[PDB]
């Protein structure tokens, strides 16, 4: 559709999930959003905000437990660096098979995997320089017990895979790209609840008011949600919000039309 409309959206109005299998490149996305050609870019500022928020949630607040399931990880691992200090076991999941290939290369420490070292050092500094980068990466690698296929739009997001009830379900920068509408968004929060213990933690971080995002020239849909619609959907899905933060920092105009980002910690009712 020549960029007139997002990829895989001509017929339905929103990028169909199989576009994440046929027309999606994790390496290109990683280079664009997590490897920086210049300092103090909007992408770098957003990543530092996410990292300080994850550090605050997992290391300063009471978000601790046995199992954490990361839903819609993408090809990234920055969102698990601080979580590995408070959770014994981490299960990482994604819809995209090429994202899963990217995570398994990182898990094996394959030379062809994306290099997360500068981000790891950054988290080590936040945490008090208790350890250096390599010791921090090895701890996270040992904490990641399973790499699974997921689909937030299904009532059993992880299929037949058996798992104990989780203490936390984390989802960063996934739901705006996976849910075509507010009813799907609410159903997806309910589907995630099925993986969670009663009183378990739900941690969500995503963009606000974004109808699309770019990976170079490739455009993908995003559910344009404001902060009120996110709170109403989280409350309707069966959770009580403990804290909710909105930041005005947005991605570069050539990468997305978001109007900030939100972070929330909720508990299953
Ligand atoms: C930055 C940024 N990074 N990303 C994450 C990214 C590249 O979209 C991704 O790899 N994802 C999430 C979607 N995901 C999925 C897609 C279809 C269905 C899924 C069913 N279950 C689970 C996951 C599903 C597959 C992994 C989004 C932004 C961003 C978003 C809005 C505005 C501005 C920036």
Swiss-Prot record:
It is an enzyme of class 2 (transferase). Changing residue 210 to A: Has no effect on N-methyltransferase activity. Keywords: Acetylation, Citrullination, Cytoplasm, Methyltransferase, S-adenosyl-L-methionine, Transferase. The keyword Methyltransferase applies. The keyword Cell membrane does not apply. The modification Citrulline is found at residues 27, 141, 190. Predominantly expressed in the liver. A lower expression is seen in the kidney, lung, skeletal muscle, placenta and heart. Not detected in the brain or pancreas. It catalyses: nicotinamide + S-adenosyl-L-methionine = 1-methylnicotinamide + S-adenosyl-L-homocysteine. Deiminated by PADI1 and PADI2. Catalyzes the N-methylation of nicotinamide using the universal methyl donor S-adenosyl-L-methionine to form N1-methylnicotinamide and S-adenosyl-L-homocysteine, a predominant nicotinamide/vitamin B3 clearance pathway. Plays a central role in regulating cellular methylation potential, by consuming S-adenosyl-L-methionine and limiting its availability for other methyltransferases. Actively mediates genome-wide epigenetic and transcriptional changes through hypomethylation of repressive chromatin marks, such as H3K27me3. This is Nicotinamide N-methyltransferase. It comes from Homo sapiens.
